[PDB]
Amino acid sequence: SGAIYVGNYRVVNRHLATHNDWANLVWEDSSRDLLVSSTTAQGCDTIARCDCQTGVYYCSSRRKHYPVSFSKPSLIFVEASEYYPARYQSHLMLAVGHSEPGDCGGILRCQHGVVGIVSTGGNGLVGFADVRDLLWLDE
Numbered sequence: 345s346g347a348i349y350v351g352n353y354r355v356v357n358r359h360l361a362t363h364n365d366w367a368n369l370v371w372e373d374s375s376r377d378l379l380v381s382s383t384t385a386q387g388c389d390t391i392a393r394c395d396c397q398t399g400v401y402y403c404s405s406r407r408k409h410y411p412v413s414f415s416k417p418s419l420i421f422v423e424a425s426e427y428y429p430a431r432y433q434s435h436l437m438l439a440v441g442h443s444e445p446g447d448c449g450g451i452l453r454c455q456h457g458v459v460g461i462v463s464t465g466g467n468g469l470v471g472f473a474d475v476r477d478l479l480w481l482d483e
């Protein structure tokens with residue numbers, strides 16, 4: 345679990361969105377596993393606007409932060425799950441690092457701010473949904 349709170353927006357994994365997220369829907373994209381809802385309170389987070397390929401992520405299944413080198417956002421095949429059929433997930437970045445399904449929502453950050461959130465993984469890999477291209481989150 346986990347979310348990004350920037351301005352009057354809450355960014356969550358689309359597969360973990362609540363009934364309240366859907367009732368306050370701003371934008372969603374199944375191919376990216378992202379959903380953004382509106383908030384009444386002002387958020388605590390800053391979004392990175394950069395091309396960093398290193399950063400640090402929070403891993404809830406270890407209660408620890410880990411440094412990672414990750415690939416640029418790209419189109420990657422993801423096997424069928426209970427949430428989605430087998431498909432290509434877009435804007436996904438992979439890195440070597442521990443992850444389990446409940447780690448989805450953990451933030452990846454570089455020195456410029458929030459880069460993305462955990463969305464997939466397994467076998468010593470962790471995959472992050474990028475948010476750096478969503479320039480509208482800042483206004």
Ligand SMILES: Cc1ccccc1CNC(=O)N1CCC[C@H](C(N)=O)C1
Pocket residue numbers: 359377422425426427428433443444445446447448463464465466467
């Ligand atoms: C092993 C692991 C580690 C971290 C996260 C997930 C997993 C394994 N489940 C998994 O990949 N999916 C279920 C949740 C939604 C995911 C998606 N983006 O399509 C697909």
Ligand SMILES: [Zn+2]
Pocket residue numbers: 392393394395396454455456457
């Ligand atoms: Zn950066």
